[PDB]
Design a protein around this ligand. Structure first.
Ligand SMILES: [Ca+2]
Length: 398
């Protein structure tokens, strides 16, 4: 009875961490909505910069939610509308002549902003009136996962535009006049561009309001109620499985190894804003938050409770010590990536350049740390009787 109650308390705190993380994501998305509204009303350099800063701030809590993926299917079924990437951005707006898009993507040049009717394969689709529901129906349209119409990175593309700088300094620099209605309009169809940005921003808020509500305590019909009623070994496996699947397949593999080994700036997570270093860092923080049972909120307060770490320490102190040390080393390696961008001005798309020896090594050191901590996660889960964790490797060999 005592062991079961301890696991129950850890899973309850786990849901509290998710509740607070998604609540922070929702509130910062509402701040972003207000800055975007202010920008559309009075588009200029300063209101555009304010919208960009609000986007940056909205990313910090969302990136810390991603280790709740994989273990909790309700997030997996939902996040493709919220944070899908990479974009074949020619679906949305104009592109430069060196535009690179996926093979076999019939939507890659549809250009919704410019056209009241598009045709993606044989779906001839009315987009006269731009609504969130309509754009959502276009995600993965025609079969290609590069066809992304909504989410953080659709907003990102509409604020920054394409990053034309390759592996050199600088991000996208779309001009505010792309949203000037009437005569100073630049890039064409600025009324449809504003309508697009408004729709995806409102849709993001609406999606985050849904998900934040699914982790509220004391609600009989939501996911959190299901999770807390499940057998504790099911809940504990979900915690470890999210930790390991983000560490290995998604963070080390999809968000680092892919771009690094192809030297492909088009594959970095935050292509247009060059914020990829923060995504990686706060993804890493998501995993460590879950294991330690703590989440430091955007206002500085801390949500904290009984930890998965303490359960492991009772079963095997060495396994717990190894995993905590691996998590600390991983955070240091990801901090070095953040520091390269924030202190030295060398962003992720510059570090993966073929000639950047120190840039590539920092990324390879963080990959190695993430692979090591994945092994330590499996060992810790095994000490709690959770065998064959099999964290998802996203088909990468490490
Ligand atoms: Ca870039």
């Amino acid at each position: 009875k005592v062991d079961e109650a301890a696991a129950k308390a850890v899973i309850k705190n786990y849901a509290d961490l998710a509740e607070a993380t998604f609540a922070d994501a929702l509130s910062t998305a509402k701040d972003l909505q207000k800055a975007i509204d202010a920008f559309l009303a009075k588009p200029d350099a300063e209101t555009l910069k304010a919208a960009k800063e609000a986007w940056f701030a909205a990313r910090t809590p969302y990136s810390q939610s991603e280790a709740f993926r994989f273990g909790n299917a309700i997030i997996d079924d939902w996040e493709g509308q919220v944070n899908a990437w990479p974009l074949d951005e020619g679906l949305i707006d104009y592109v430069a002549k060196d535009y690179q898009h996926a093979l076999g993507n019939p939507g890659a040049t549809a250009n919704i902003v410019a056209n009241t009717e598009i045709q993606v394969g044989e779906d001839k689709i009315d987009v006269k009136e731009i609504t969130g529901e309509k754009l959502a129906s276009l995600n993965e349209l025609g079969g290609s996962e590069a066809n992304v119409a909504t989410g953080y990175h659709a907003i990102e593309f509409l604020l920054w535009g394409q990053d034309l700088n390759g592996t050199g300094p600088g991000a996208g620099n779309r001009p505010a006049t792309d949203y000037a209605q009437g005569k100073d309009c630049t890039g064409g169809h600025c009324d449809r561009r504003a309508a697009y940005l408004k729709a995806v921003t409102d849709l993001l808020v609406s999606d985050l309001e849904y998900m934040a509500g699914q982790w509220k305590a004391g609600v009989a019909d939501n996911y959190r109620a299901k999770l807390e009623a499940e057998p504790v070994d099911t809940g504990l496996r979900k915690m470890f499985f999210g930790m390991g699947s983000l560490s290995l397949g998604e963070l080390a593999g999809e968000r680092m190894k892919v771009a690094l080994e192809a030297n492909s700036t088009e594959d970095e997570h935050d292509c247009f804003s060059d914020d990829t270093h923060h995504t990686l860092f706060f993804n890493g923080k998501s995993i460590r938050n879950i294991y330690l049972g703590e989440y430091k909120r955007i206002d500085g307060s801390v949500v904290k409770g009984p930890s998965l770490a303490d359960l492991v320490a009772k079963a095997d102190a060495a396994a717990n010590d190894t995993l905590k040390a691996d998590l600390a080393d991983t955070e240091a390696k990801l901090q070095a990536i953040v520091d390269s961008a924030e202190k030295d001005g060398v962003h992720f798309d510059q570090m993966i350049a073929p000639d950047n020896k120190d840039g590539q090594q920092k990324i390879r050191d963080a990959i190695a740390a993430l692979v090591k901590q994945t092994g330590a996660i499996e060992q810790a889960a095994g000490k709690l009787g959770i065998q064959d964790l099999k964290p998802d490797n996203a088909d990468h060999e490490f």
